[PDB]
């Protein structure tokens, strides 16, 4: 913990020189992190941060604040027209911020209060380094989990929703998509504005429907779970917009949500019930489509679930269908 003390000192000193140089310009050469051996200092701290005891130690020294200050000043100074040394420093800083925000109420609140830093994080979602995108999305995921009211407000105001959703459309790797969709699933639960901002991004809804049938090479359900959780969270709005329901229908959303009802993942089943609850309301064509696919018996099979949202959503969707039995069914016509 002397070692940690020393590395944090190096970081704070470097930040202080950067802030002097910035403040020289208000009413010496520009500091370069390579000239202060910053990348190895944050690398070490990043490695230490995986251990719970080392994290407690870091927190007594304000490690989160100092590493956030570093990230923020480097982004301000060099933006996205930076070099590899700088991309590297931001990655290892971002990993550390992920580890330090995990489960940590104070650390989340502090970081979300740093508005400059929050803006810097969101800007990195467009980094040439997709791995850096993954790292930044991991931070945002943590910050969006159990966010207090000020932190929710900040996450929204810095444009994290639209940025993440745009990000998702361009990523090539599963790991990046997992972190991006997890952050978006958390964000989608905060407020209706966030739900609207997802639905507004051109191509998002189709993309999200696409994730419901993702073929993970790593024998996991993480992508289906997060993509379906976003969808279930935005379905209340989708239900109001015929254009949006149409996008869903013509990417085979409905037959997929019915197949989800049989999952071993309670998360997948719950997400599907919640989305069906909303999409089964009002629209006779979607009601009839669902009747024709045997939704009624499928939903009846879940109404006794121990899982409160599964039981609630299945029964609600079922009442929607049962109240609107299509004319062709009424023994005919």
């Amino acid at each position: 913990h002397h070692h940690m003390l020393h590395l944090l000192e190096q970081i704070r000193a470097y930040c202080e020189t950067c802030w002097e140089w910035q403040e020289a310009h208000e009413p010496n050469p520009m500091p370069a992190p390579v000239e202060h051996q910053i990348c190895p200092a944050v690398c070490v701290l990043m490695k230490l941060s995986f251990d719970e005891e080392h994290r407690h130690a870091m927190n007594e020294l304000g490690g989160l604040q100092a590493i956030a200050e570093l990230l923020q000043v480097d982004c301000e100074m060099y933006g996205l027209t930076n070099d590899h040394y700088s991309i590297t420093l931001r990655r290892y800083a971002g990993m550390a911020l992920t580890n330090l925000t995990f489960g940590d109420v104070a650390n989340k609140a502090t970081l979300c209060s740093m508005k400059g830093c929050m803006r810097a994080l969101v800007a990195q979602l467009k980094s040439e380094s997709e791995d850096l995108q993954q790292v930044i999305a991991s931070v945002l995921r943590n910050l969006s989990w159990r966010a207090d009211v000020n932190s929710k407000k900040t996450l929204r105001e810095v444009g994290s929703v639209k940025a993440l959703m745009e990000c998702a459309l361009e990523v090539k790797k599963e790991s990046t998509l997992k972190s991006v969709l997890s952050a978006l699933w958390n964000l989608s639960a905060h407020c209706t504005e966030n739900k609207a901002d997802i639905c507004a991004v051109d191509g998002a809804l189709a993309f999200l429907v696409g994730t419901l049938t993702y073929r993970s090479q790593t024998n996991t359900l993480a992508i289906i779970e997060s993509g379906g959780g976003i969808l279930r969270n935005v379905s209340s709005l989708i239900a109001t917009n015929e254009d949006h329901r149409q996008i869903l229908r013509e990417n085979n959303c409905l037959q997929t949500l019915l197949q989800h009802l049989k999952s071993h993942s309670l998360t997948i089943v719950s997400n599907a019930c919640g989305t069906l609850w909303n999409l089964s309301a009002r629209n006779p064509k979607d009601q009839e489509a669902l009747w024709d696919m045997g939704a009624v018996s499928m939903l009846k099979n879940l109404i006794h679930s121990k899982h409160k949202m599964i039981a609630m959503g299945s029964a609600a969707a079922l009442r929607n269908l049962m109240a609107n039995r299509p004319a062709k069914y009424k023994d005919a016509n």
Binding site: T101, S138, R141, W145, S175, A183, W185, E225
Partner: peptide, 7 residues
């Protein structure tokens, strides 16, 4: 989705 350590 929940929170987590860097992966």
């Amino acid at each position: 989705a929940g929170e987590s350590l860097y992966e």
